Amino acid sequence: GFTSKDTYLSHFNPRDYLEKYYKFGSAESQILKHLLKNLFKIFCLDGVKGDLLIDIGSGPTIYQLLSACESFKEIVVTDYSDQNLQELEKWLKAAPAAFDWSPVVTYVCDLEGNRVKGPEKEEKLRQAVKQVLKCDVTQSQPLGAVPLPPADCVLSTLCLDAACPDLPTYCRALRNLGSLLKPGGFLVIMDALKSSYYMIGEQKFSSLPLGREAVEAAVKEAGYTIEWFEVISQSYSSTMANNEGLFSLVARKL
């Protein structure tokens, strides 16, 4: 009764996803602002830094990397959908058909103290991303045959509830992400709470409807220790998703 993974290869329209959720002209923009403030706190204020960050289930978005590129020498972006990776690559290569992230980039520049302007921030992110890879969080080796050094941080925004059909798969996906992380490395997860679907126009996608207690229990079961955990009450618009807020957490792998 859950969206098959192959649906993401064919029916997840990357440009329509960006238009619906990330235009930043709403509930969607309020959630985006909150995610950006937390990402800034984690990568710029807290000590989350290193040589390598792997972003899991990036989709076609780059908002979740704008503060991270200040703290990591390399960022690897990954997703199950090759269409999503191609949309990412249009932005990375600064193609005229790429999505316009400038209002979001400006917002992050403002949060960070106006030390830099938009073009410098975007160039820093483009220089940080060297690999754009296929991933499947449900597999013991999420990156398949591709080898990577153990990462200093694994980040995943709005991916795991969409990717995992049940709670045992969710806990296994957290272990599988841990196989990419060095001992003591950081796990940063942000996702919807209690959502059983989300929409991209008329296309429905399933989501696993977890509450905060089940998320925390799955992270401890998967072998991490949690440093902080935040719940926000703001939910998406009713035409988009049936969540009851969102969570953000930072944990370390044992």
Ligand X SMILES: Nc1ncnc2c1ncn2[C@@H]1O[C@H](CSCC[C@H](N)C(=O)O)[C@@H](O)[C@H]1O
Ligand Y SMILES: COc1ccnc(C)c1C
Tell which one of 84, 206, 235, 243 touches ligand X (CB under 6 A): 84
**Is residue 110 a known part of a binding site?**
no
Q: In what order do the strands lie in the sheet with 72-79?
A: 129-134, 72-79, 50-55, 151-157, 181-192, 246-253, 224-232
| β-sheet bridge partners, residue 129 | 75
Cβ closer to ligand X: 67 or 81?
81
138 to 177: interface string for ligand Y, x by CB under 6 A = --------------------x--xx---------------
Tell which one of 38, 195, 235, 248 touches ligand Y (CB under 6 A): 195
Helix (H) or strand (E) holding 224: strand 224-232
Whether 250 contacts 187, CB under 8 Å: yes
- Give SS3 for 116: coil
Tell which one of 80, 99, 170, 236 touches ligand Y (CB under 6 A): 236
Q: Give phi and psi for 100, each to the nearest 5.
A: -90, 100
Q: What is the rounded CA–CA span in Å between residue 18 and residue 143? A: 25
**Is residue 22 a known part of a binding site?**
yes
Tell which one of 38, 64, 176, 248 touches ligand X (CB under 6 A): 64
Q: What is the rounded CA–CA span in Å between residue 160 and residue 2? A: 13
**Is residue 166 a known part of a binding site?**
no
**Is residue 224 a known part of a binding site?**
no
**H-type helices in the chain, by residue range?**
6-10, 14-21, 27-40, 82-92, 102-111, 118-128, 160-163, 167-178, 212-221
Instruction: Return the amino acid letter for 249.
Output: L
Cβ closer to ligand Y: 52 or 218?
218
5 binds ligand X (CB under 6 A): yes
Cβ closer to ligand X: 120 or 166?
166
Pairing of strands 224-232, 129-134: unpaired
Using the rule CB under 6 A, give the single segment among 1-9, 92-100, 213-221, 234-242 that binds ligand Y.
Answer: 234-242
DSSP states along 51-76: EEEEESS-TT--GGGTTGGGTEEEEE
Q: How far is the CB of 143 from ligand X (least distance, A)?
A: 10
**Is residue 157 a known part of a binding site?**
yes
Using the rule CB under 6 A, give the single segment among 85-93, 103-111, 130-138, 213-221 that binds ligand X.
Answer: 130-138
Tell which one of 13, 138, 169, 203 touches ligand X (CB under 6 A): 138
Detail the residues annotated as belonging to a binding site. 17, 22, 57, 63, 79, 84, 136-137, 157, 191, 207
Detail the residues annotated as belonging to a binding site for nicotinamide. 191, 207
Binding site for ligand X (CB under 6 A): 5, 8, 12, 57-59, 61, 64, 79-81, 84, 135-138, 157-159, 162-163
Binding site for ligand Y (CB under 6 A): 21, 158, 161-162, 192, 195, 198, 207, 236, 240-241
